[PDB]
Design a protein around this ligand. Structure first.
Ligand SMILES: Nc1nc2c(ncn2[C@@H]2O[C@H](COP(=O)(O)OP(=O)(O)OP(=O)(O)O)[C@@H](O)[C@H]2O)c(=O)[nH]1
Ligand SMILES: Nc1nc2c(ncn2[C@@H]2O[C@H](COP(=O)(O)OP(=O)(O)O)[C@@H](O)[C@H]2O)c(=O)[nH]1
Ligand SMILES: [Mg+2]
Lengths: 445, 451
């Protein structure tokens, strides 16, 4: 019934979706061709939230594949589960973005996008009840930032009441993937900040940390990271996909998660993340899970959340557990770690609980956090946009694509207005003073 | 003869609904498809299961019920579970998309999609009742649909069924536990509607009911499933005299003064006794004195506020099973002696009493105390003031920063409408205070009456 549309933009976004669709397919026990013989009726009864039933007992995912190149698509079509996709949903260029937002958003994608919107329309009309529009992409490169903006723009116009969500990869604090990554990460956000209800800030440097430090991986690779990432995307939807003691969809989470209409840029995180070398020496309990939810180091984003305060948090637990054990553990952290939280949002927590655990675990917990500390991204990228823009580096690549530097100036100005709004709500008091003025007139009569 | 109706709105409502209809089909020996496999009737007798079950067909009986959330999945589980055949499928309404913990969706933009459907099904339900007494309603009061739609339903019954008993049972938000962020706003937006319409409102609390379950009942890590099966013992007990014969009964038209000391204050607390494990009831035996004294203990109330911080105003005690009035009347005397209980000066005749013959029906596997003789207690106290005084401050904290206001505005409420609710909440604060005195003077208590 309540049916999400997925998009997968550029090389990065495509490969997160390519992992996503092995991973949720496995959770629903789906056969690599789009068949089924799996062990549970419950698994199949609900799948529709991410699938369509093709004739003679067959299953297709509500996925759109999006790229300005012939590259990465050819590998999804040869990989594990490459067969489930409707061949029609590959609508593709012969040009690339060139690491350039404006080539995505005002040239090569601008020439292609109406051919992709035509698949978005057809999947949105083939929905029962259209729920949302999720995107895997990046913000520091050219294609998923640039084409994905242009899609979001055109779809956010068409479907104003549906949720509009972005599982974004974002540039890391210390070493870079592409040199123009701060321009890309400003110009895409200069569209997304008033065209999304939800967006994520995924720091692959923290995934590389969590892959060595917690998960204890010897050679850690995209193979790993896109699992860790896609766990979080199937994990946030578990309270819509499946029954539990607290069902909760993405918008029911978002109303609790976003206080003011630009504070929607979230810190992700999962528990447990104990290695295969450590399983036998750790227990799998709500205390142990809630410990690793709020451990700084486990944070799949740019910073320790104690460079800020939590405006809001949401916990989406999975598997059979005492709601009382959960509620007590979420009450302990609010009262032992109260300095981590914004004080005029009285209690910062939304809780949800699915009966169904992920594969190979006793229980887990998906976590969405909103801390004012996410300015550690935006202080960097606005500065790093400025540092190159201030000497006018790389600029003719983008103004070759129908840009003027007034749009660059306007956008780094918007990012200052954003990081200043995020600071405006940082460290603000739960008390607001009265006056010392005096009533009537003052005599000893 | 006569009928109650049963309404579950939003996911807590619904979930509690699998719990209370399970208990009602134990307590009457109804199997999961509506058959009464040990029926004995002469036909056309009493036989009061007909107050809660409509007889269908050959001897299918059918719960006098309706259910909704605007999310499918929660009503789909009733449609699929142990009792799927118990329900008539047109009871089980759903929406396209949850009310998203915004009251505004439940009362305007999503709720309008299901309301006159919802009411048409009830018209059909009440058209079949012989002497409808009223409506008893579980709802997610702090939720999306449990907040917005229950209160839209209340307003939309009250124009047609204004003479029926309109009774409801929330889940209330809790002094340190928190399941959602906007829980307080919806709590006020719904209190601000259903104060004009409801004839009583029975507040109960998860953070409270856990502690009783880990203390008394001695349940190590309670579930929401455990909880809904405990919460089920309040409505069970206040229906015992609509379901079995007794030495003293009530009807729905009784609780709406005997729990309502003055109309704005329609907000009692409740509990049920003894609430102990097997190992404890094996070990040690309780009497109807002890079990009346336990209902007045702070640690034993299904809401977190200490009765001592306030004062009592109105009380209903509902005895089930092997007990006699000569003991029961002296056990209330007890509660009349210990000045650790204080009632208000306006209420020297503060006890109302009922006595049903049927013992509580022992649960499956015998997982509860084997006590033939259990008691429900329900009371209106001034101590609830200290549970509202947190909630109305939690509004004042968020609304100063307009935090989350934009989703309410998003679905079509105006800042005028959250401000009007908040000023009746500072008025509710004033109505808890009009009894904060000894005074008799004629606008709070009458100068020409004597108690
Ligand atoms: N005791 C108890 N409380 C519950 C249960 N389910 C939910 N709650 C409480 O009720 C609140 C609201 O639950 P929701 O799932 O949001 O109810 P809803 O009315 O369906 O809200 P929408 O889904 O937004 O329409 C939760 O935050 C809990 O405090 C339950 O089965 N038992
Ligand atoms: N997590 C993740 N990051 C990736 C992946 N592939 C590339 N990236 C990052 O995402 C960005 C590139 O996004 P993309 O839209 O493909 O850009 P383009 O190649 O410049 O058009 C860079 O910051 C890359 O480091 C991957 O598979 N997973
Ligand atoms: Mg709901």
């Amino acid at each position: 019934m309540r049916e999400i549309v997925h998009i997968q933009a550029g090389q990065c976004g495509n490969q997160i979706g390519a992992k996503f669709w092995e991973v949720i397919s496995d959770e629903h026990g789906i056969d690599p061709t789009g068949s089924y013989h799996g062990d549970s009726d419950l698994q199949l009864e609900r799948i529709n939230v991410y699938y369509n039933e093709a004739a003679g007992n067959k299953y297709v995912p509500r996925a759109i594949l999006v790229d300005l190149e012939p590259g990465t698509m050819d590998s999804v079509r040869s990989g594990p589960f490459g067969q489930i996709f409707r061949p029609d949903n590959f609508v593709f260029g012969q040009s690339g973005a060139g690491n350039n937002w404006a080539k995505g958003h005002y040239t090569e994608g601008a020439e292609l996008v109406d051919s992709v919107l035509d698949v978005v329309r057809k999947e949105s009309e083939s929905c029962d009840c259209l729920q949302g529009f999720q995107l895997t992409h990046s913000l520091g490169g050219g294609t998923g930032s640039g084409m994905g903006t242009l899609l979001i723009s055109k779809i956010r116009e068409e479907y104003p009441d549906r949720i509009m969500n972005t599982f974004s990869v974002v540039p890391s604090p210390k070493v870079s993937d592409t040199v123009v990554e701060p321009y890309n990460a400003t110009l895409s956000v200069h569209q997304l900040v008033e065209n999304t209800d939800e967006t994520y800030c995924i720091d692959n440097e923290a995934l590389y940390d969590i892959c060595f430090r917690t998960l204890k991986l010897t050679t850690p690779t995209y193979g790993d990271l896109n699992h860790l990432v896609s766990a979080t995307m199937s994990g946030v939807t578990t309270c819509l996909r499946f029954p539990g003691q607290l069902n909760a969809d993405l918008r029911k989470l978002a109303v609790n998660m976003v206080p003011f209409p630009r504070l929607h840029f979230f810190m992700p995180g999962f528990a447990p993340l104990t290695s295969r070398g450590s399983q036998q020496y750790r227990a799998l309990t709500v205390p142990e899970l809630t410990q690793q939810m709020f451990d700084a180091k486990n944070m799949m984003a740019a910073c320790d959340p104690r460079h800020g305060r939590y405006l809001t948090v949401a916990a989406v637990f999975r598997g059979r557990m005492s709601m009382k054990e959960v509620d007590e553990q979420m009450l302990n952290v609010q009262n032992k770690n109260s300095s981590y939280f914004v004080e005029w949002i009285p209690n910062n927590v939304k809780t949800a609980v699915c009966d169904i655990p992920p594969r190979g675990l006793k229980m887990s917990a998906t976590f969405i956090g909103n801390s004012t500390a996410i300015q550690e991204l935006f202080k960097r990228i606005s500065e790093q946009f400025t540092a190159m823009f201030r000497r006018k580096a790389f600029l003719h690549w983008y103004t070759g694509e129908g840009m003027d530097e007034m749009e660059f100036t306007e956008a780094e100005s918007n990012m200052n207005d954003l990081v200043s709004e995020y600071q405006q709500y940082q460290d603000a008091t739960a008390d607001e003073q009265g006056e010392f003025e005096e009533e009537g007139e003052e005599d000893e009569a | 003869m006569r009928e109650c109706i049963s309404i579950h709105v939003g996911q807590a409502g619904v979930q509690i609904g699998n719990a209370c209809w399970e208990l009602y089909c134990l307590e009457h020996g109804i199997q999961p498809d509506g058959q009464m496999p040990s029926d004995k009737t002469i036909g056309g007798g009493d036989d009061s299961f007909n107050t809660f079950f409509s007889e269908t067909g050959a001897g299918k009986h059918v719960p006098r019920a309706v259910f909704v959330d605007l999310e499918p999945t929660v009503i789909d589980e009733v449609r699929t579970g142990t009792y799927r055949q118990l329900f008539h499928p047109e009871q089980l309404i759903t929406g396209k998309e949850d009310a998203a913990n915004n009251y505004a969706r439940g009362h305007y933009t999503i709720g309008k999609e299901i309301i006159d459907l919802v009411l048409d099904r009830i018209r059909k339900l009440a058209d079949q009742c012989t002497g409808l007494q009223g409506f008893l309603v579980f709802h997610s009061f702090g939720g999306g649909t449990g907040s917005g739609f229950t209160s839209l339903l209340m307003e939309r019954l009250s124009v047609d069924y204004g003479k029926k008993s309109k009774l409801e049972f929330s889940i209330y938000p809790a002094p340190q536990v928190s399941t959602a962020v906007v829980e307080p706003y919806n709590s006020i937006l719904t209190t601000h509607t259903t104060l004009e319409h409801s004839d009583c409102a029975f507040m109960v609390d998860n953070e409270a009911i856990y502690d009783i379950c880990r203390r008394n009942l001695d349940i190590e890590r309670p579930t929401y499933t455990n909880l809904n099966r405990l919460i089920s013992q309040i409505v069970s007990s206040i229906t015992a005299s609509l379901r079995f014969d007794g030495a003293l009964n009530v009807d729905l038209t009784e609780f709406q003064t005997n729990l309502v000391p003055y109309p704005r204050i329609h907000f009692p607390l409740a509990t049920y006794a003894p609430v102990i494990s097997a190992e404890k009831a094996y070990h040690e035996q309780l009497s109807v004195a002890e079990i009346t004294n336990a209902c007045f203990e702070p640690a034993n109330q299904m809401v977190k506020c200490d009765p001592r911080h306030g004062k009592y105003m109105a009380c209903c005690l509902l005895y089930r099973g092997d007990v006699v009035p000569k003991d029961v009347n002296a056990a209330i005397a007890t509660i009349k002696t210990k000045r650790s209980i204080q009632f208000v000066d306006w209420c020297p005749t503060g006890f109302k009493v009922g006595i049903n013959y049927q013992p509580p029906t022992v649960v499956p596997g015998g997982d509860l105390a084997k006590v033939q003789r259990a008691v429900c207690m329900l009371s209106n106290t001034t101590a609830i003031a200290e549970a509202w005084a947190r909630l109305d401050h939690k509004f004042d904290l968020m609304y100063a920063k307009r935090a989350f206001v934009h989703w309410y505005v998003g679905e079509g409420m105006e800042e005028g409408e959250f401000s009007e609710a908040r000023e009746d909440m500072a008025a509710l604060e004033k109505d808890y205070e009009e009894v904060g005195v000894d005074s008799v003077e004629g606008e709070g208590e009458e100068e020409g009456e004597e108690y």
